[PDB]
Structures are given as structure tokens and as C-alpha cells.
């Protein structure tokens, strides 16, 4: 085969003998195997933990700079509003055109604010992903993954397809997982224990 391929017996046959081994929902395997979602094969921790504070400072600087650019855009919009007011008060235009242009201007301001909030929330989402990035996590919305890799190419590695699951199996020790499941069984108890 030119590319790795999963064996359907251990993926689709209920219970999915790949979901239990890797602790992934059958839908997650359905997506990762059939190229409908990316998966974090692994995420570097030391290269994350050591640089966490520095990257927090860098993100603070980035958010401040983006907010400053947005505030400059809003200042330009306010200058446009001032020009509109000057035009209104220069010649004779009664409440019809006054309200028309003022509604246009406030709509533009609301659009600028919406762009601001969307960009800020995009960066917040990026950081939430970064502070929650762990193995066996599906990153749908290719645009989001592209932003994550472009801004942070290192600190993690995500793949997609059968080779991603092959990588997960390679970076998967059997003794620690067995110990964890035995601990959950003997101690704890409940639906956790059944699963």
C-alpha cells in the first residue's frame, strides 16, 4: 500500500477494538480514519511548560497590538463620522438624510467592533487550545488547525488518516494504561469501572 490502512475488523466491529485500545469514541475513529478531522498525535510538554510564561507574555503583547490596531481603525471611523457630521451641518439636509447617514456610521462602528470581538475570541480560542492540547484530541475546522500550526509550528504534531492512528499506537505504552485501568477498577468504581 502507498499509504497505511486500518483493518476494518478491529475498527468497525462492535465493540471497536481500536476505540478501546486508544480510548477514542467510535465517531472519533470514523473521522480520523476517513479524513474528516485532524488528530493530535502528540504534544510536547517540556517545550510547552518551559515556554508557557514567555508565550503568555508574547500573547499579551500580540493582543495589545491587535487591540491598538483595531482602536486605530475605530478612530478612523470616528473621523469619518466627524466628516459626515460636518457635511450634514454644512448644507441643508433634514432628519431623513441625517438619520440615514448616522445609521450607516453606527452600523460601520458596530461592524468594526464585531471584527474586534471575533479576532479577540479567535486568539482566546487559540490559547484555550494550546493550554488544553493533549494527545487524542480531534481538531476539526482545518482553518483553526492551520492557524495553530502557522502561529505555533512546533510544540506539537498533528496528523490525519491511518498513519495518525499508527503514530498514536507507536507512542502508546501498554503497561501504564493497564495500570491506570486496573487502578480505576480496583479503586474508584462505577460506570468508570465498567468502561
Amino acid at each position: 500500500l502507498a499509504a497505511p490502512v486500518t483493518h476494518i475488523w478491529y475498527f468497525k466491529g462492535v465493540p471497536s477494538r481500536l476505540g478501546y485500545l486508544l480510548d477514542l469514541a467510535p465517531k472519533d475513529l470514523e473521522k480520523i480514519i476517513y479524513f474528516a478531522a485532524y488528530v493530535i498525535t502528540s504534544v510536547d510538554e517540556e517545550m510547552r511548560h518551559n515556554e508557557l510564561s514567555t508565550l503568555e507574555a508574547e500573547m499579551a503583547v500580540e493582543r495589545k497590538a491587535v487591540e491598538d490596531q483595531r482602536d486605530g481603525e475605530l478612530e478612523a471611523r470616528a473621523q469619518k463620522l466627524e466628516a459626515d457630521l460636518a457635511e450634514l451641518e454644512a448644507e441643508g439636509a433634514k432628519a431623513d438624510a441625517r438619520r440615514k447617514v448616522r445609521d450607516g456610521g453606527e452600523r460601520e462602528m458596530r461592524q468594526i467592533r464585531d471584527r474586534a470581538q471575533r479576532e479577540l475570541d479567535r486568539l482566546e480560542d487559540i490559547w484555550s487550545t494550546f493550554t488544553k492540547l493533549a494527545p487524542k484530541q480531534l481538531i476539526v475546522d482545518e482553518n483553526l488547525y492551520r492557524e495553530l500550526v502557522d502561529r505555533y509550528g512546533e510544540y506539537f504534531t498533528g496528523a490525519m488518516g491511518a498513519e495518525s492512528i499508527q503514530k498514536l499506537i507507536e507512542n502508546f505504552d501498554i503497561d501504564a494504561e493497564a495500570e491506570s485501568l486496573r487502578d480505576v477498577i480496583r479503586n474508584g468504581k462505577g460506570q468508570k469501572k465498567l468502561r
Binding site: A36, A37, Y38, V140, D141, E142, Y145
Partner: peptide, 8 residues
């Protein structure tokens, strides 16, 4: 032919 879900 989308990349993840929607056309890319």
C-alpha cells in the same frame, strides 16, 4: 474535495 469537512 474539502480538507477536513467543508470545501477548501
Amino acid at each position: 474535495v474539502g480538507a477536513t469537512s467543508r470545501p477548501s
